Amino acid sequence: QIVVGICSMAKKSKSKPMKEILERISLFKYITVVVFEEEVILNEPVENWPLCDCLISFHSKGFPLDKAVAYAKLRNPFVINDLNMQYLIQDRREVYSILQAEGILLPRYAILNRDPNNPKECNLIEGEDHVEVNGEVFQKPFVEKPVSAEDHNVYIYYPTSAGGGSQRLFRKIGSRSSVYSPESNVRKTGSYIYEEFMPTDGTDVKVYTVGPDYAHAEARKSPALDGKVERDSEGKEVRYPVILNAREKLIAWKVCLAFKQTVCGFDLLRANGQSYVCDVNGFSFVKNSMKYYDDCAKILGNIVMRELAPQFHIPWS
Numbered sequence: 001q002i003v004v005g006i007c008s009m010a011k012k013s014k015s016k017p018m019k020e021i022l023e024r025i026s027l028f029k030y031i032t033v034v035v036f037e038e039e040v041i042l043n044e045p046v047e048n049w050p051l052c053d054c055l056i057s058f059h060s061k062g063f064p065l066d067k068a069v070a071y072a073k074l075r076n077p078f079v080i081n082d083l084n085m086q087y088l089i090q091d092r093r094e095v096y097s098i099l100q101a102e103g104i105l106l107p108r109y110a111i112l113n114r115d116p117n118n119p120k121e122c123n124l125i126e127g128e129d130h131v132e133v134n135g136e137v138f139q140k141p142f143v144e145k146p147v148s149a150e151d152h153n154v155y156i157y158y159p160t161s162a163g164g165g166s167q168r169l170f171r172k173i174g175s176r177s178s179v180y181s182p183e184s185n186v187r188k189t190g191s192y193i194y195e196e197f198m199p200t201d202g203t204d205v206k207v208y209t210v211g212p213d214y215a216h217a218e219a220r221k222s223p224a225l226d227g228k229v230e231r232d233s234e235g236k237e238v239r240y241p242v243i244l245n246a247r248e249k250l251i252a253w254k255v256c257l258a259f260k261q262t263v264c265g266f267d268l269l270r271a272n273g274q275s276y277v278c279d280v281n282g283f284s285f286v287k288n289s290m291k292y293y294d295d296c297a298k299i300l301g302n303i304v305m306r307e308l309a310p311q312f313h314i315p316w317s
């Protein structure tokens with residue numbers, strides 16, 4: 001049997017989408033799935049981790065990426081989602097630099113780095129209705145993102161013409177994704193990316209790749225609006241249908257290969273007749289789509305078979 005190893009925190013490994021997809025991958029005649037126990041990932045040295053021929057491994061809060069990297073170096077499996085790139089995906093400055101190198105449209109932005117060892121002072125000038133970051137002017141409205149991609153405390157600053165103040169986004173807490181603050185002054189501690197506000201129809205497009213030639217998209221209400229989460233009868237966030245255009249399918253192809261993440265979530269802003277990438281999240285499954293479960297398991301199983309069938313001497317056409 002070809003062994004597919006799943007290496008992630010239990011919250012991910014035991015998620016509904018993961019269980020649905022692993023059950024379908026196991027339907028492949030020559031594939032066996034081994035899900036690495038969280039206790040083993042955290043507390044056992046990598047030399048005691050299970051063997052696999054193909055490794056599906058991804059960082060989330062609490063995951064020891066250093067260990068996953070050492071395991072891949074030790075055992076040299078076929079890696080679906082590159083582990084070294086998952087360090088860069090944690091840093092919005094590294095994400096944006098990769099997108100730029102790939103000729104991918106993204107909001108105009110500037111980085112404000114505050115050295116806490118070298119705070120003689122910042123390169124930031126603030127007016128009522130704009131900031132200047134290393135000389136570059138952002139008129140309100142503009143967006144302020146922590147450089148840490150794991151920190152979801154993204155602020156939007158409104159112009160005087162629209163009543164001033166700010167919208168403070170955060171990781172969903174039940175009914176809410178953002179709240180208005182009367183505060184008009186930017187944050188004075190930390191490092192941030194400042195970017196131009198892209199005007200959408202009030203929705204974000206979420207894109208989910210399975211290799212560079214498959215991308216499911218769906219839309220949700222922007223947290224940049226009032227911050228009230230729309231939930232269905234079953235208490236799941238309301239999703240709106242999306243079909244990607246030819247330009248957007250090319251963006252998905254580029255993001256998947258540039259970040260070396262077979263399974264990759266990213267966000268698109270449909271604005272000014274174009275589509276801008278504002279976030280790359282790495283490993284992410286579509287939630288509550290049976291057809292996605294079917295398609296994702298079939299593509300990942302076929303990738304494994306195409307890559308490893310020859311050295312296993314298994315017929316594959």
Ligand SMILES: O=C(N[C@@H]1[C@@H](OP(=O)(O)O)[C@H](OP(=O)(O)O)[C@H](OP(=O)(O)O)[C@H](OP(=O)(O)O)[C@H]1OP(=O)(O)O)C(F)(F)P(=O)(O)O
Nearest residue numbers: 011012060061171172206235236237265281283284285287
């Ligand atoms: O907010 C939710 N789930 C989110 C995950 O949070 P966890 O439940 O895993 O903590 C989050 O994971 P982290 O970034 O917090 O680790 C990530 O799920 P992912 O691991 O599949 O990426 C994210 O999706 P993205 O933001 O798209 O990465 C999910 O949000 P939903 O897409 O709303 O389910 C929710 F509470 F489950 P819902 O019931 O509101 O969907």
Ligand SMILES: Nc1ncnc2c1ncn2[C@@H]1O[C@H](COP(=O)(O)OP(=O)(O)NP(=O)(O)O)[C@@H](O)[C@H]1O
Nearest residue numbers: 107143152195196197198204222223224267278279
């Ligand atoms: N330049 C922008 N213009 C307009 N809206 C933006 C912009 N950047 C971000 N947003 C909005 O703010 C939301 C959060 O920004 P995003 O960079 O996706 O944050 P995050 O903290 O990485 N979220 P997540 O998708 O869960 O990882 C987006 O979904 C948009 O609705």
Ligand SMILES: [Mg+2]
Nearest residue numbers: 026028029031
């Ligand atoms: Mg099987």
Ligand SMILES: [Mg+2]
Nearest residue numbers: 059060281283
């Ligand atoms: Mg994540």
Ligand SMILES: [Mg+2]
Nearest residue numbers: 266267278279
């Ligand atoms: Mg996002």
Ligand SMILES: [Mg+2]
Nearest residue numbers: 149279280281
């Ligand atoms: Mg993100």
